[PDB]
Short mmCIF file of C-alpha atoms and ligand atoms in Angstrom, two decimals:
data_model
loop_
_atom_site.label_atom_id
_atom_site.label_comp_id
_atom_site.label_asym_id
_atom_site.label_seq_id
_atom_site.Cartn_x
_atom_site.Cartn_y
_atom_site.Cartn_z
CA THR A 1 -8.71 -36.52 -20.56
CA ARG A 2 -6.33 -36.55 -17.82
CA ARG A 3 -3.71 -38.34 -20.23
CA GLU A 4 -0.05 -38.63 -18.97
CA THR A 5 2.93 -40.13 -20.72
CA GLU A 6 6.42 -40.75 -19.54
CA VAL A 7 9.41 -39.31 -21.53
CA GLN B 1 9.32 -15.83 -17.88
CA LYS B 2 10.80 -18.09 -20.40
CA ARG B 3 13.77 -19.73 -19.40
CA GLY B 4 15.92 -22.60 -20.67
CA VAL B 5 17.03 -25.90 -18.72
CA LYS B 6 19.45 -28.38 -20.25
CA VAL B 7 18.63 -31.97 -19.49
CA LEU B 8 20.81 -35.07 -20.20
CA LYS B 9 18.48 -38.16 -20.53
CA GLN B 10 19.58 -41.28 -18.76
CA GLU B 11 18.84 -44.62 -20.10
CA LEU B 12 16.21 -45.25 -17.29
CA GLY B 13 13.22 -43.01 -17.71
CA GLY B 14 14.53 -40.78 -20.21
CA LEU B 15 13.89 -37.43 -19.36
CA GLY B 16 12.59 -38.51 -15.90
CA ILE B 17 9.10 -36.71 -16.54
CA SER B 18 5.51 -37.22 -17.37
CA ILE B 19 3.63 -34.55 -19.67
CA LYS B 20 -0.08 -33.67 -19.82
CA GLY B 21 -2.09 -32.52 -22.33
CA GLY B 22 -2.00 -30.95 -26.14
CA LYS B 23 -4.11 -29.11 -28.25
CA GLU B 24 -6.73 -31.56 -28.45
CA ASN B 25 -7.22 -31.28 -24.77
CA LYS B 26 -6.86 -27.19 -25.55
CA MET B 27 -3.81 -27.28 -22.96
CA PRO B 28 -0.37 -26.43 -23.67
CA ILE B 29 2.10 -29.15 -23.04
CA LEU B 30 2.79 -29.44 -19.50
CA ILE B 31 5.10 -31.27 -17.21
CA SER B 32 2.79 -33.41 -14.93
CA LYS B 33 5.32 -35.45 -13.05
CA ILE B 34 9.28 -35.15 -12.08
CA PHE B 35 10.45 -38.53 -10.93
CA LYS B 36 12.62 -38.67 -8.02
CA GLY B 37 16.42 -39.49 -8.78
CA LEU B 38 15.89 -39.22 -12.62
CA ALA B 39 17.45 -36.61 -15.18
CA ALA B 40 15.13 -33.73 -14.77
CA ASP B 41 15.10 -34.17 -11.26
CA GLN B 42 18.85 -33.86 -10.92
CA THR B 43 18.86 -30.33 -12.83
CA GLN B 44 16.67 -28.82 -10.01
CA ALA B 45 15.47 -26.51 -12.76
CA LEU B 46 11.97 -27.65 -13.73
CA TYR B 47 8.72 -27.66 -11.88
CA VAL B 48 5.49 -29.27 -12.23
CA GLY B 49 3.22 -27.17 -14.04
CA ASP B 50 5.91 -25.83 -16.56
CA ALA B 51 5.04 -25.56 -20.01
CA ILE B 52 7.36 -26.93 -22.57
CA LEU B 53 7.40 -24.54 -25.71
CA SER B 54 10.16 -26.06 -27.71
CA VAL B 55 12.77 -29.11 -27.53
CA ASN B 56 16.25 -28.24 -29.10
CA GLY B 57 14.22 -25.56 -31.74
CA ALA B 58 11.26 -27.85 -32.31
CA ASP B 59 8.31 -25.69 -31.27
CA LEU B 60 5.46 -27.13 -29.25
CA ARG B 61 3.06 -24.36 -28.43
CA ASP B 62 0.46 -25.86 -30.99
CA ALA B 63 1.44 -29.57 -30.54
CA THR B 64 -0.78 -32.26 -29.74
CA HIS B 65 0.10 -34.78 -27.30
CA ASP B 66 1.30 -37.37 -29.43
CA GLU B 67 3.40 -34.55 -31.39
CA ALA B 68 5.04 -33.73 -28.16
CA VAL B 69 5.69 -37.36 -27.07
CA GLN B 70 7.39 -37.90 -30.45
CA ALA B 71 9.49 -34.93 -30.21
CA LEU B 72 10.42 -35.38 -26.68
CA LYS B 73 11.57 -39.19 -27.14
CA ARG B 74 13.37 -38.56 -30.53
CA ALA B 75 15.54 -35.77 -28.79
CA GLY B 76 19.12 -36.73 -28.26
CA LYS B 77 21.04 -37.44 -24.90
CA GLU B 78 21.45 -33.56 -24.50
CA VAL B 79 18.05 -31.76 -24.41
CA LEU B 80 17.44 -27.96 -24.24
CA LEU B 81 13.82 -27.19 -22.94
CA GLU B 82 12.41 -23.83 -23.19
CA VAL B 83 9.93 -23.81 -20.34
CA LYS B 84 7.45 -21.28 -18.77
CA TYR B 85 5.68 -21.89 -15.37
CA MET B 86 1.94 -21.43 -16.87
CA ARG B 87 0.53 -22.13 -13.25
CA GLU B 88 -1.37 -19.19 -12.11
CA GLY B 89 -0.35 -17.82 -8.78
CA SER B 90 -0.29 -14.49 -7.11
CA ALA B 91 3.35 -12.58 -6.46
CA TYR B 92 1.99 -10.66 -3.70
CA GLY B 93 1.88 -13.51 -0.97
CA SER B 94 4.34 -13.58 1.94
CA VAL B 95 4.61 -17.48 1.78
CA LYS B 96 6.65 -18.66 -1.01
CA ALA B 97 7.24 -22.24 -2.58
CA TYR B 98 10.30 -23.87 -0.18
CA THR B 99 13.32 -24.25 -2.85
CA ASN B 100 14.67 -27.40 -1.50
CA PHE B 101 11.46 -29.22 -1.22
CA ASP B 102 11.33 -32.83 0.04
CA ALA B 103 7.99 -33.96 1.02
CA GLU B 104 9.14 -37.21 2.29
CA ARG B 105 11.93 -35.71 4.44
CA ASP B 106 9.56 -33.15 5.71
CA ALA B 107 7.05 -35.88 6.58
CA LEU B 108 9.71 -37.95 8.54
CA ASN B 109 10.69 -34.83 10.53
CA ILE B 110 7.27 -33.98 11.37
CA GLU B 111 6.50 -37.64 12.69
CA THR B 112 9.76 -37.20 14.70
CA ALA B 113 8.71 -33.85 16.02
CA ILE B 114 5.20 -35.22 17.14
CA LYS B 115 6.70 -38.23 18.80
CA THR B 116 9.61 -36.44 20.58
CA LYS B 117 8.83 -35.72 24.27
CA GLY B 118 6.65 -32.71 24.94
CA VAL B 119 6.23 -32.17 21.22
CA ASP B 120 8.60 -30.51 19.08
CA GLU B 121 6.41 -27.49 18.11
CA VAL B 122 9.57 -25.20 16.71
CA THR B 123 10.26 -27.70 14.23
CA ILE B 124 6.60 -28.21 13.24
CA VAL B 125 5.99 -24.40 12.84
CA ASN B 126 9.27 -24.07 11.08
CA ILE B 127 8.32 -26.51 8.70
CA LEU B 128 4.58 -26.00 7.91
CA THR B 129 4.71 -22.23 8.08
CA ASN B 130 7.47 -22.22 5.26
CA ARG B 131 5.64 -24.23 2.84
CA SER B 132 3.37 -23.56 0.24
CA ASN B 133 0.00 -24.95 0.40
CA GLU B 134 0.51 -26.97 -2.34
CA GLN B 135 3.49 -28.42 -0.52
CA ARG B 136 1.78 -29.02 2.53
CA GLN B 137 -0.63 -31.42 0.73
CA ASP B 138 2.26 -33.12 -0.49
CA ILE B 139 3.60 -33.62 2.90
CA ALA B 140 0.39 -34.77 4.19
CA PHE B 141 0.29 -37.30 1.22
CA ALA B 142 3.76 -38.64 2.24
CA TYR B 143 3.10 -38.68 5.92
CA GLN B 144 -0.14 -40.76 5.56
CA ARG B 145 1.96 -43.11 3.21
CA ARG B 146 4.88 -43.67 5.72
CA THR B 147 3.27 -43.37 9.15
CA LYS B 148 -0.08 -45.06 7.67
CA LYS B 149 -1.98 -41.96 9.73
CA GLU B 150 -3.44 -38.98 8.53
CA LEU B 151 -1.50 -35.66 9.43
CA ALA B 152 -4.20 -33.43 10.35
CA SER B 153 -5.27 -35.98 12.94
CA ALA B 154 -2.02 -36.38 14.42
CA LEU B 155 -1.25 -32.62 14.67
CA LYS B 156 -4.67 -32.31 16.36
CA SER B 157 -3.35 -34.61 19.02
CA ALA B 158 -0.32 -33.30 19.39
CA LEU B 159 -1.23 -29.32 19.44
CA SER B 160 -3.53 -27.25 21.19
CA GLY B 161 -5.03 -23.77 21.49
CA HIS B 162 -4.37 -21.06 18.99
CA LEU B 163 -1.27 -22.79 17.74
CA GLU B 164 -3.66 -25.91 16.72
CA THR B 165 -6.10 -23.56 15.23
CA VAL B 166 -3.21 -21.93 12.71
CA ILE B 167 -1.87 -25.24 12.05
CA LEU B 168 -4.81 -27.01 11.27
CA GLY B 169 -5.99 -24.16 9.20
CA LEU B 170 -2.70 -24.07 7.14
CA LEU B 171 -3.34 -27.76 6.10
CA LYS B 172 -6.66 -27.53 4.46
CA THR B 173 -6.75 -26.18 0.82
CA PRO B 174 -7.67 -22.62 0.24
CA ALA B 175 -11.37 -23.69 -0.57
CA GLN B 176 -11.54 -26.22 2.51
CA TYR B 177 -10.58 -23.54 4.71
CA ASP B 178 -13.23 -21.02 3.59
CA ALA B 179 -15.82 -23.73 3.09
CA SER B 180 -14.96 -24.80 6.78
CA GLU B 181 -14.91 -21.42 8.11
CA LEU B 182 -18.33 -20.66 6.42
CA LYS B 183 -19.94 -23.70 8.02
CA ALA B 184 -18.34 -22.84 11.68
CA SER B 185 -20.03 -19.45 11.09
CA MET B 186 -23.40 -21.13 10.65
CA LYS B 187 -23.13 -23.53 13.74
CA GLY B 188 -25.41 -23.71 16.62
CA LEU B 189 -28.01 -21.45 17.49
CA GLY B 190 -26.28 -18.29 16.75
CA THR B 191 -24.68 -16.92 13.45
CA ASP B 192 -21.46 -15.24 13.17
CA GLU B 193 -22.50 -12.76 10.79
CA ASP B 194 -19.19 -10.92 10.92
CA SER B 195 -17.03 -13.86 9.90
CA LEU B 196 -19.85 -14.82 7.20
CA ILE B 197 -19.67 -11.34 5.71
CA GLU B 198 -15.80 -11.09 5.78
CA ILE B 199 -15.46 -14.37 3.41
CA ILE B 200 -18.37 -13.80 1.31
CA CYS B 201 -17.57 -9.73 0.69
CA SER B 202 -13.92 -10.43 -0.32
CA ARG B 203 -13.66 -13.55 -2.29
CA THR B 204 -13.68 -13.56 -5.87
CA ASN B 205 -15.74 -15.33 -8.37
CA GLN B 206 -13.03 -18.04 -9.07
CA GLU B 207 -12.64 -18.56 -5.38
CA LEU B 208 -16.31 -18.63 -4.72
CA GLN B 209 -17.08 -21.30 -7.56
CA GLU B 210 -14.30 -23.64 -5.77
CA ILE B 211 -15.91 -22.81 -2.49
CA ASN B 212 -19.39 -23.74 -3.76
CA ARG B 213 -18.28 -26.91 -5.07
CA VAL B 214 -16.17 -28.02 -2.06
CA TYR B 215 -18.86 -26.71 0.45
CA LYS B 216 -21.28 -29.33 -1.06
CA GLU B 217 -18.77 -31.99 -1.32
CA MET B 218 -17.91 -31.62 2.44
CA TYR B 219 -21.36 -31.06 3.81
CA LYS B 220 -23.66 -32.70 1.45
CA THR B 221 -25.76 -29.46 1.18
CA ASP B 222 -25.50 -26.37 -0.79
CA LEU B 223 -23.93 -23.39 0.44
CA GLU B 224 -26.71 -21.07 -0.61
CA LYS B 225 -29.07 -23.30 1.17
CA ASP B 226 -26.95 -23.08 4.43
CA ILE B 227 -27.11 -19.02 4.13
CA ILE B 228 -30.77 -18.87 3.38
CA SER B 229 -31.62 -20.85 6.66
CA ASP B 230 -29.19 -18.71 8.87
CA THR B 231 -29.86 -15.21 7.23
CA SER B 232 -33.03 -13.25 6.66
CA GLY B 233 -34.28 -10.15 4.97
CA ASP B 234 -32.25 -8.11 2.56
CA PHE B 235 -28.97 -9.42 4.43
CA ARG B 236 -29.95 -12.54 3.16
CA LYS B 237 -30.56 -11.26 -0.54
CA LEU B 238 -27.20 -9.87 -0.38
CA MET B 239 -25.30 -12.63 0.85
CA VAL B 240 -27.12 -14.99 -1.49
CA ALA B 241 -26.29 -13.05 -4.61
CA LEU B 242 -22.49 -12.28 -3.43
CA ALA B 243 -21.85 -15.98 -2.82
CA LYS B 244 -23.21 -17.01 -6.38
CA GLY B 245 -19.87 -15.70 -7.72
CA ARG B 246 -21.27 -14.63 -10.88
CA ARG B 247 -19.85 -11.02 -10.91
CA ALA B 248 -19.34 -9.69 -14.33
CA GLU B 249 -15.56 -10.03 -15.29
CA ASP B 250 -13.16 -6.95 -15.82
CA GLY B 251 -13.80 -6.05 -19.41
CA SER B 252 -11.43 -4.34 -21.80
CA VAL B 253 -13.53 -1.17 -22.18
CA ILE B 254 -14.19 1.40 -19.67
CA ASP B 255 -18.57 1.95 -19.90
CA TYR B 256 -18.48 5.66 -18.94
CA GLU B 257 -22.04 5.97 -19.63
CA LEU B 258 -23.02 3.02 -17.31
CA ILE B 259 -20.59 4.44 -14.56
CA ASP B 260 -22.47 7.68 -14.38
CA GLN B 261 -26.01 5.99 -14.71
CA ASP B 262 -24.91 3.38 -11.64
CA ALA B 263 -23.89 6.51 -9.70
CA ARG B 264 -27.23 8.28 -10.21
CA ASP B 265 -29.05 4.97 -9.49
CA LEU B 266 -27.34 4.51 -6.12
CA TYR B 267 -27.86 8.06 -5.38
CA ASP B 268 -31.50 7.96 -6.27
CA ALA B 269 -32.13 4.52 -4.23
CA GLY B 270 -30.78 5.88 -1.10
CA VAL B 271 -29.48 9.57 0.03
CA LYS B 272 -32.06 11.05 -2.33
CA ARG B 273 -35.24 9.57 -1.33
CA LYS B 274 -37.04 8.51 2.15
CA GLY B 275 -35.74 5.24 2.95
CA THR B 276 -33.62 2.82 0.63
CA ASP B 277 -34.27 0.94 -2.66
CA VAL B 278 -32.07 -1.81 -1.18
CA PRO B 279 -32.68 -4.16 -4.49
CA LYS B 280 -31.10 -1.58 -6.51
CA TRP B 281 -28.29 -1.24 -4.29
CA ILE B 282 -27.88 -5.14 -4.24
CA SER B 283 -28.02 -5.17 -8.07
CA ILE B 284 -25.60 -2.73 -8.94
CA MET B 285 -22.86 -3.77 -6.45
CA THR B 286 -23.00 -7.65 -6.93
CA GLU B 287 -23.21 -7.56 -10.53
CA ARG B 288 -20.66 -4.69 -12.03
CA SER B 289 -17.02 -5.72 -12.28
CA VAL B 290 -14.42 -4.52 -9.55
CA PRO B 291 -12.95 -1.72 -11.52
CA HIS B 292 -16.18 -0.41 -12.83
CA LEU B 293 -17.47 -0.05 -9.29
CA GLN B 294 -14.37 1.72 -8.40
CA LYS B 295 -15.14 4.29 -10.87
CA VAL B 296 -18.84 4.35 -9.87
CA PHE B 297 -18.10 5.40 -6.23
CA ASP B 298 -16.01 8.04 -7.35
CA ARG B 299 -18.49 9.31 -9.63
CA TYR B 300 -21.01 8.95 -7.05
CA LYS B 301 -19.24 11.68 -5.03
CA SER B 302 -20.10 14.12 -7.82
CA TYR B 303 -23.65 13.66 -7.08
CA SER B 304 -24.02 12.96 -3.28
CA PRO B 305 -22.73 15.39 -0.45
CA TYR B 306 -21.59 11.88 1.01
CA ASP B 307 -19.20 9.35 -0.04
CA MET B 308 -20.50 5.64 -0.61
CA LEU B 309 -19.35 4.35 2.97
CA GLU B 310 -20.97 7.33 4.62
CA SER B 311 -23.97 6.80 2.66
CA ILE B 312 -24.23 3.42 3.75
CA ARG B 313 -24.01 4.38 7.50
CA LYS B 314 -26.63 6.88 7.02
CA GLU B 315 -29.20 4.64 4.91
CA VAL B 316 -29.23 1.36 6.74
CA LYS B 317 -28.40 -0.54 9.69
CA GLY B 318 -27.49 -3.89 11.62
CA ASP B 319 -25.99 -6.83 9.56
CA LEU B 320 -27.21 -5.24 6.43
CA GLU B 321 -25.04 -2.01 6.85
CA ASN B 322 -21.97 -4.26 8.02
CA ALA B 323 -22.32 -6.03 4.70
CA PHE B 324 -22.28 -3.24 2.50
CA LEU B 325 -19.54 -1.56 4.29
CA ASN B 326 -17.54 -4.70 4.31
CA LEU B 327 -18.40 -4.84 0.57
CA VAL B 328 -17.53 -1.57 -0.53
CA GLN B 329 -14.30 -1.79 1.26
CA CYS B 330 -13.16 -4.90 -0.59
CA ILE B 331 -13.92 -3.16 -3.74
CA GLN B 332 -12.02 0.04 -3.25
CA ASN B 333 -9.02 -1.12 -1.58
CA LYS B 334 -8.97 -5.20 -0.48
CA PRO B 335 -5.41 -5.09 0.88
CA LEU B 336 -6.63 -1.93 2.96
CA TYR B 337 -9.81 -3.69 4.09
CA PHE B 338 -7.65 -6.59 5.74
CA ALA B 339 -5.19 -4.37 7.24
CA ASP B 340 -8.06 -2.55 9.08
CA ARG B 341 -9.38 -5.71 10.19
CA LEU B 342 -6.11 -7.21 11.44
CA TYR B 343 -5.54 -3.80 13.55
CA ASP B 344 -9.18 -4.07 14.81
CA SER B 345 -8.40 -7.61 15.87
CA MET B 346 -5.56 -6.77 18.05
CA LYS B 347 -5.75 -2.62 18.85
CA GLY B 348 -7.57 -3.19 22.19
CA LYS B 349 -7.55 -5.53 25.25
CA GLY B 350 -6.83 -9.06 24.41
CA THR B 351 -6.92 -10.21 20.81
CA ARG B 352 -9.81 -11.39 18.43
CA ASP B 353 -7.66 -14.34 17.58
CA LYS B 354 -10.24 -16.12 15.13
CA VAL B 355 -10.00 -13.10 12.77
CA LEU B 356 -6.36 -12.72 13.13
CA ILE B 357 -5.51 -16.25 12.32
CA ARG B 358 -8.20 -16.51 9.46
CA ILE B 359 -6.77 -13.69 7.97
CA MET B 360 -3.03 -14.58 8.12
CA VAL B 361 -3.79 -18.02 6.95
CA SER B 362 -6.18 -17.15 4.15
CA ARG B 363 -4.23 -14.24 2.61
CA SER B 364 -0.73 -15.53 3.26
CA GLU B 365 -0.63 -16.59 -0.41
CA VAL B 366 -2.82 -13.89 -1.93
CA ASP B 367 -2.04 -10.20 -1.18
CA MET B 368 -0.23 -10.18 2.39
CA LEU B 369 2.40 -8.05 1.07
CA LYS B 370 0.24 -5.49 0.08
CA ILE B 371 -1.83 -5.87 3.07
CA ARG B 372 1.51 -5.26 4.99
CA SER B 373 2.12 -2.16 2.81
CA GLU B 374 -1.31 -0.50 3.73
CA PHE B 375 -0.82 -1.83 7.26
CA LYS B 376 2.89 0.09 7.74
CA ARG B 377 1.62 3.25 5.62
CA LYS B 378 -1.78 3.84 7.81
CA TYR B 379 -0.87 2.52 11.47
CA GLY B 380 3.12 3.65 11.17
CA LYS B 381 4.18 0.33 12.68
CA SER B 382 4.33 -3.00 10.82
CA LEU B 383 1.96 -5.81 11.28
CA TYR B 384 5.01 -8.09 12.28
CA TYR B 385 5.38 -5.39 15.46
CA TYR B 386 1.51 -5.72 16.25
CA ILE B 387 1.45 -9.30 16.34
CA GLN B 388 4.63 -9.27 18.34
CA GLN B 389 2.79 -7.29 21.08
CA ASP B 390 -0.49 -9.26 21.00
CA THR B 391 0.44 -13.06 20.79
CA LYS B 392 3.36 -15.07 22.39
CA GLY B 393 5.04 -18.54 22.00
CA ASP B 394 5.09 -20.69 19.02
CA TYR B 395 1.49 -19.26 18.17
CA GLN B 396 3.29 -15.97 17.85
CA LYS B 397 6.20 -17.59 15.90
CA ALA B 398 3.72 -19.39 13.43
CA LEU B 399 1.84 -15.83 12.81
CA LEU B 400 5.17 -14.04 12.06
CA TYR B 401 6.13 -16.59 9.94
CA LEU B 402 2.72 -16.13 7.82
CA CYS B 403 3.50 -12.42 8.09
CA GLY B 404 6.68 -12.76 6.28
CA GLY B 405 8.69 -10.23 8.19
CA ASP B 406 9.17 -6.77 9.26
CA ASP B 407 8.35 -3.67 7.26
CA1 CA C 501 6.84 -28.69 23.77
CA1 CA C 502 -6.35 -30.82 19.89
CA1 CA C 503 -27.09 -21.02 13.25
CA1 CA C 504 -32.68 7.52 2.12
CA1 CA C 505 -4.34 -6.45 21.69
#
């Protein structure tokens, strides 16, 4: 999972 | 090194970062992006690849992705991050990351340097030799985005001679450079066994795993198959075994019983008998860990009147001998191995530019500082000094930047 999330 | 960074959230972007991972990805919470012009960018204290360990006291070491997102989104305007760069690297390279890096500005200045009358090689060298390899890839990306042309092709047209060789080598990733150097050593009717030996004997398991993958991606064939085509005999078997990159990893315990047995086996296979049991030498020197083999070669001195290097010279000849000699040096003292190869590349008439360039490019972010120490200790003058006497022009300046300085 290359999962990115902006914060 | 755990460090604390205070970030002030802005209503556009929040922290201005993106994160990757979590425990469900068996990863620590990692900063993936830092948006230009946002909150975390203006701190100039956070780097991509940082592990966020806590947010205003809330521990994130064993947090999932969603747990970290919620903790990072909940935190008020002022945010204290405890971060720790967890990106593995070397502290003994001479080329460090540039501390005010702007990939767009560098790409724009490199475009200006290329288009200027006569080409501004000084600016091109001053930039590319003073950026890390990762930063060069970002410069190459921004260059293609702004000019709509690949950076490597533009520099090949603008540059020539040895300077082109250095600059184009610096632009490849480490695995890409080694793969292309390996392909070059097996091109045409002949074979450059010296260059083939230098790379295969000195690269670690992790480095070789990446070379094997990238080589097939670049040339649509396995590296091992090309080695088999261009080598033969015991030299082929040693090169194929080494290129697999499945050397035993450095364990916690020292296996003294096996150290002694390997030493006797190396002695029985060579100096003690007529001829040589080359398969036994290949097995021991390719399978055992490097710290183990260092102790084996010392214990070998207890049984043999000659040390391992002198034993190789008396037992085998040709490419096989050169392979074993290079391999043992890489095991005993790899920075000294490269220091000696650099010296041989310059000591005599002219310069062996291919070897000099390949070492300065490939070791600049690994162990160039140790290479320099061994060089100055043995030869009395610095590597910097020797490069000065053997090269000239912008080619010289690029190599001096890769050297990193005087000793
Ligand atoms: Ca010029
Ligand atoms: Ca050219
Ligand atoms: Ca060939
Ligand atoms: Ca013998
Ligand atoms: Ca010379």
